Amino acid sequence: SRFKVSKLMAYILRHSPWEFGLEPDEEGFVSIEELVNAVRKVYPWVTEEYIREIVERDEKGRYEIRGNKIRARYGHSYPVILRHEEDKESKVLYHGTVRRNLKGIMREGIKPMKRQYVHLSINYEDAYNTGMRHGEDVVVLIIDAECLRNKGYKILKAGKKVRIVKHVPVDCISGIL
Ligand SMILES: Nc1ncnc2c1ncn2[C@@H]1O[C@H](COP(=O)(O)O)[C@@H](O)[C@H]1O
Ligand SMILES: Nc1ncnc2c1ncn2[C@@H]1O[C@H](COP(=O)(O)O)[C@@H](O)[C@H]1O
Ligand SMILES: [Cl-]
Ligand SMILES: [Cl-]
Numbered sequence: 001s002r003f004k005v006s007k008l009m010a011y012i013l014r015h016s017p018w019e020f021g022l023e024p025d026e027e028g029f030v031s032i033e034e035l036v037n038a039v040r041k042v043y044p045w046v047t048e049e050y051i052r053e054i055v056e057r058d059e060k061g062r063y064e065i066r067g068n069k070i071r072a073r074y075g076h077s078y079p080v081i082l083r084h085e086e087d088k089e090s091k092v093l094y095h096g097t098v099r100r101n102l103k104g105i106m107r108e109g110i111k112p113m114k115r116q117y118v119h120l121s122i123n124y125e126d127a128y129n130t131g132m133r134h135g136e137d138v139v140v141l142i143i144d145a146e147c148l149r150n151k152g153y154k155i156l157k158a159g160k161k162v163r164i165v166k167h168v169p170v171d172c173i174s175g176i177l
């Protein structure tokens with residue numbers, strides 16, 4: 001299924017390319033032909049056309065293809081440089097997290113923790129669902145993106161809904177949901 005193959009694509013492109021003999025470039029790109037070869041080690045019926053269809057149909061915009069190169073746009077667990085188009089349109093964004101982080105966030109802002117980018121979403125439901133990944137005490141922070149930009153932070157379009165930024169200062173958090 002698309003769900004099973006996309007799950008393997010995401011694992012290879014974000015977390016363990018070397019396991020499949022792929023070496024991502026500094027921006028996380030690998031040869032799409034080599035990704036087909038890697039994926040067919042699990043799912044031999046997969047084709048390059050299929051992988052391209054998965055990219056086109058992915059509801060989050062998880063994947064990006066440029067020429068012969070394919071990458072995950074966000075979510076890597078290894079170091080990657082992500083030079084995505086700037087989001088200049090959003091005025092409000094959302095950050096889903098858990099209540100236990102509020103004390104630290106309220107003093108320090110939203111900080112990069114292991115990855116070098118803070119993850120935001122244009123969609124409140126998406127942020128809520130993403131916060132649920134860290135537990136049941138979910139809170140969603142409303143972020144004044146215009147304020148973020150005015151402070152000189154560039155917000156990049158990493159998916160259809162995901163947005164990335166270096167840091168969210170406390171005074172850009174307008175509310176807690
Ligand atoms: N079910 C999940 N629970 C927790 N973290 C996840 C889950 N799925 C993916 N992740 C992590 O969150 C990132 C984004 O997932 P997604 O936005 O669904 O592509 C992944 O690259 C992983 O780092
Ligand atoms: N200052 C902070 N104190 C505590 N937790 C934070 C802080 N800044 C960010 N976080 C959390 O760190 C986590 C990073 O998740 P991810 O960006 O998916 O790796 C999210 O749950 C954030 O809400
Ligand atoms: Cl690996
Ligand atoms: Cl693309």
Ligand SMILES: [Cl-]
Nearest residue numbers: 074075076117
């Ligand atoms: Cl990321």
Ligand SMILES: [Cl-]
Nearest residue numbers: 027081082083
């Ligand atoms: Cl990049």
Ligand SMILES: [Cl-]
Nearest residue numbers: 027082083084
């Ligand atoms: Cl680039």
Ligand SMILES: [Cl-]
Nearest residue numbers: 095096127130
């Ligand atoms: Cl979020």
Ligand SMILES: [Cl-]
Nearest residue numbers: 130131133134
């Ligand atoms: Cl997550």
Ligand SMILES: [K+]
Nearest residue numbers: 058061062063
């Ligand atoms: K995609």
Ligand SMILES: [K+]
Nearest residue numbers: 013028071072
């Ligand atoms: K990648």
Ligand SMILES: [K+]
Nearest residue numbers: 102103106107
């Ligand atoms: K506090």
Ligand SMILES: [K+]
Nearest residue numbers: 117118119120
């Ligand atoms: K984050």
Ligand code: NA
Nearest residue numbers: 119130133134
């Ligand atoms: Na997370």
